[PDB]
């Protein structure tokens, strides 16, 4: 792992994770990029060096540190034209922030167009030397991070606007496309008798994945950086951008066992060993498993998750017992997504720069109809009713700068004002189940924070809004470095083909 103080060099390279060679966006030579790690309390100084040369995958870039509150450092959050102008090619920029009050499993990714889909994405872990779950496992390290990624043989800007699924699911950066079932698979080495904290991170641009391990159950103890009550399951459906820690007891027979991550669409199942990797106990031969999959009889259900430590829900025990309730009505017209009649188009001047330049009201802020001004020190409820009007369901919505209470989960008609799980990416379910997924949070974090579908192609088609939280305090609370002030002039000076 690198960090907390590190250079991250962004370049274009040839990679072949599934044996097919293509140009991708890589981080210190690799994709998924390297694990960034620190401890709770750390200051991170992550120097992002943009040495990109390929305009099709974008020569400019911007990195988001997914799940971090970034309190007082809203300028470092990453979304292009919300929190900064992109870094320009040939330049570097220092993201410099603290993580005083969080620990768990995160990730980092480009937040410029669909560039993370082209490879700029990797895992990010913040350890707790007082982790309340430490008694449950023996091993937690670089090799117990498990990444899932959808991989495409055509680049983001070159294929369909809304791809019908990936060529290959990669697990720790390797996997098979169904045409070449010879390509090397990832191996996750375990040792009989040891308990492992596996940190499962979905780096997905689009599909969700139903993750299982032949012969083993999984005890979930963390959900998107929030410590849970331990929950034993035999399969986990994990949506783009979500994270779970699970404990795996390596107390079965020394052998090879299939690791399975079946996407919701694209190449499904496991023929040829697609959608798979290998759990190899030490001593087992260097061969593919021959285990078979059994029916999941205890699948994860989000409603079954609860915080480890009692965490009151923001507001009061009633539908709309909050200071401000916002409903998000979805639409789609074949090319673009809309929220409450507005398809997001990034503004010329980043929302944060507009605020620092005096714009504190929805009337003054751009894009018009896409920015919701929130009062300070208030409870907020947001509902995302599933509708046939928004194909590509279930949409995993993400709120930057906050961890929220999921008061109503997909596939559940029930509202939990008592002990609902908190997380930062939530499936908004389907119109088939009449879902009306609802979240709550408190506005104690001044700044503009993106709220958007985490299917990158949908974000790109406009499926986003901005929550402009406590705009009158943004300037005082988030002092900006000169390097940040320099971004927009430099970017705006670029030829459009060097963007
Ligand atoms: C900027 O980044 C973008 C996004 O990735 C790059 O876009 C690529 O554009 C090229 C050229 O326009 C496209 O090439 C097409 O590629 C396909 C598939 O190619 C792959 O499969 C081959 C078959 O086995 C194999 O030879 C290739 O290997 C080479 O390429 C890789 C990757 O760079 C390299 O690592 C290797 O060393 C090899 O050099 C590769 O694995 C190919 O089939 C296409 O050909 C049909 O296409 C044309 C028109 O129909 C025709 O002339 C041919 O007869 C052929 O039948 C074509 O060459 C490519 O698909 C794009 N990549 C992606 C992921 O979308 C762009 O290249 C980058 N620019 C720079 C400067 O690198
Ligand atoms: C992961 O979780 C799943 C679900 O919780 C769990 O599956 C359960 O496994 C047990 C294995 O103990 C299954 O029950 C067995 O079923 C067989 C077939 O009917 C019976 O013959 C077994 O009886 C023998 O073994 C018992 C000990 O448990 C003796 O008490 C008994 O007298 C017999 O000798 C036994 O009942 C159970 O049905 C499943 N439940 C399902 C599928 O819902 C699985 O074991 C867990 N995996 C791991 C590795 O922990
Ligand atoms: C999903 O829940 C939201 C939030 O409760 C609902 O929107 C509210 O509906 C009632 C109408 O009976 C209004 O009084 C509230 O003011 C609404 N909030 C709005 C529109 O901002 C929504 O109706 C529910 N939708 C579905 C499909 O169940
Ligand atoms: C969908 O709406 C967008 C944004 O308003 C518009 O520019 C686009 O042309 C529309 N597309 C179709 C297919 O109607
Ligand atoms: Cu994200
Ligand atoms: Cu985020
Ligand atoms: Cu979506
Ligand atoms: Cu985001």
By the 8 A CB rule, do 438 and 381 touch?
yes
Q: How far is CA 342 from CA 81, 84, 107, 202, 468, in A?
A: 17, 22, 29, 28, 16
DSSP letters, 349-418, are: S-HHHHHHTT--STTTSSSTTSEEEE-SS-EEEEEEE--TTS-SPSPEEEETT--EEEEE-TT-----SS
**Encoded tokens for 221:** 């103890």
User: Are 393 and 493 found together in one domain?
Assistant: yes
Does 336 contact ligand 4 (Cβ within 6 A)?
A: yes
Q: In sequence order, what are the residues at sequence separation of 6 or more whose Cβ sits closer than 8 angstroms to the Cβ of residue 340?
A: 327, 328, 329, 369, 465
Q: Are 105 and 142 in contact (CB under 8 A)?
A: no
Give CA–CA dist 275/267, Å, rounded.
8
One domain, residues 161 and 185: yes
Shared-domain flag, residues 42 and 189: no
Q: What is the CATH number of the domain that holds 160?
A: 2.60.40.420
| C-beta of residue 151 within 8 angstroms of C-beta of residue 18 | yes
Tell me which residue has tokens 């009505």: 329
Beta strands in 138-250 (DSSP E): 145-151, 168-171, 187-190, 195-202, 209-213, 218-223, 226-233, 236-238, 243-249
**Alpha carbon separation from 469 to 377, 442, 472, 479 (Å, rounded):** 9, 10, 9, 16
Query: What is the length of the chain?
Result: 499
Residues near ion ligand 6 (Cβ under 5 Å):
66, 400
Task: Assess whether 192 and 98 both reside in one domain.
Answer: no
Q: Are residues 99 and 183 in the same domain?
A: no
Q: What is the phi-psi region of residue 193: left when phi exceeds 0, alpha when psi lies from -120 to 50, beta otherwise?
A: left
Distance between start and end Cα atoms, the chain: 30
The residues near 154 (Cβ < 8 Å, ≥ 6 apart) are none
Number of folded domains that form the chain: 3
| One domain for residues 158 and 246 | yes
Q: Which domain holds residue 381?
A: 310-499
Resolution in A: 1.8
Does residue 312 have a cis bond before it (omega within 30 degrees)? no
The number of angstroms, rounded, from the C-alpha of 443 to the middle of its chain's C-alpha atoms is 21
Q: Do 274 and 178 contact (CB within 8 A), yes or no?
A: yes
Note whether 69 and 139 are same-domain residues: no
The residue among 252, 279, 309 that closes a domain is 309
Q: Residue 153, annotated ligand binder? A: no
Please tell me the distance from the alpha carbon of residue 291 to that of residue 136, in angstroms, as a whole number.
Answer: 26
Q: Do 172 and 67 fall into the same domain?
A: no
Domain termination site, one of 281, 309, 337: 309
Q: Which of 276, 309, 342 is the last residue of a domain?
A: 309
Residues 434 and 358 in one domain: yes
Q: What is the DSSP string of 137-150?
A: -SB-SGGGEEEEEE
Residue nearest to atom 6 of ligand 3 (CA): 327
Q: How was this structure determined?
A: X-ray
User: How far apart are alpha carbons 66 and 429 in whole angstroms?
Assistant: 22
State the CB neighbour count (10 A cutoff) for residue 320.
12
Ligand 1, residue 152: give the atom nearest the CA.
64
* 473 and 331, same domain (yes or no): yes
Residues 423 and 377 in one domain: yes
Check if 316 has its Cβ closer than 6 Å to any atom of ligand 3: no
Catalytic site positions: 64, 66, 109, 111, 395, 398, 400, 452-455, 458, 463
């Amino acid at each position: 792992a690198v960090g907390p103080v590190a250079d991250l060099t962004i370049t274009d390279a040839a990679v072949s994770p599934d044996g097919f060679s293509r140009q991708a966006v890589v981080v210190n030579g690799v994709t998924p990029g390297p694990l960034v790690a620190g401890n709770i309390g750390d200051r991170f100084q992550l120097n992002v060096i943009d040495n990109l040369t390929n305009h099709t995958m974008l020569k400019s870039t911007s990195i988001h540190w997914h799940g971090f509150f970034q309190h007082g450092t809203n300028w470092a959050d990453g979304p292009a034209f919300i929190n900064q102008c992109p870094i320009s090619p040939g330049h570097s920029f220092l993201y410099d922030f603290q993580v005083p009050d969080q620990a768990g499993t995160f990730w980092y990714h480009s937040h410029l167009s669909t560039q993370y889909c082209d490879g700029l994405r990797g895992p990010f872990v913040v350890y707790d030397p007082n982790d309340p779950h430490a008694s449950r496992y023996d091993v937690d390290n670089d090799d117990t991070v498990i990444t899932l990624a959808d991989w495409y043989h055509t680049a983001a800007k070159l294929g369909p606007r809304f791809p019908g699924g990936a060529d290959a699911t990669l697990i720790n950066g390797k996997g098979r496309a169904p045409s070449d079932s010879v390509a090397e698979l990832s191996v996750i080495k375990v040792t009989k008798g040891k308990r492992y904290r596996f940190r499962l991170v979905s780096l997905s641009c689009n599909p969700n994945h139903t993750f299982s391990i032949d012969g083993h159950n999984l005890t979930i103890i963390e959900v998107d950086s929030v410590n849970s009550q331990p929950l034993e399951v035999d399969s986990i459906q994990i949506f783009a951008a979500q994270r779970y820690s699970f404990v795996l007891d390596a107390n079965q027979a020394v052998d090879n066992y299939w690791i399975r991550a079946n996407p919701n669409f694209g190449n499904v199942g496991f023929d040829g060993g697609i959608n798979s990797a290998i759990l190899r106990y030490d001593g087992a031969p260097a061969v593919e498993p021959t285990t078979n999959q059994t029916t999941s009889v205890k699948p994860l259900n989000e409603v079954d998750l609860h915080p480890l430590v009692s965490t009151p829900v923001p507001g009061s025990p009633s539908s709309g017992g909050v200071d401000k309730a916002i409903n998000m009505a979805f639409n789609f017209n074949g090319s673009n997504f809309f929220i409450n009649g507005a398809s997001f188009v990034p503004p010329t001047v980043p929302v944060l720069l507009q605020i620092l330049s005096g714009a504190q009201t929805a009337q003054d802020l751009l894009p018009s109809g896409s920015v919701y001004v929130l009062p300070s020190n208030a409870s907020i409820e947001i509902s995302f009713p599933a509708t046939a009007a928004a194909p590509g369901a279930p949409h995993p919505f993400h709120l930057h700068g906050h961890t929220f209470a999921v008061v109503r989960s997909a596939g559940s008609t029930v509202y939990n004002y008592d002990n609902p799980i908190f997380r930062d990416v939530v499936s908004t379910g389907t119109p088939a189940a009449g879902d009306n997924v609802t979240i709550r949070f408190d506005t104690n974090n001044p700044g503009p924070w993106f709220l958007h579908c985490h299917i990158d192609f949908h974000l790109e088609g406009g499926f986003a809004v901005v929550m402009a939280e406590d705009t009158p305090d943004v300037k005082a609370v988030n002092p900006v470095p000169q390097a940040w002030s320099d971004l927009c002039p430099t970017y705006d000076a670029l030829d459009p083909n060097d963007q």
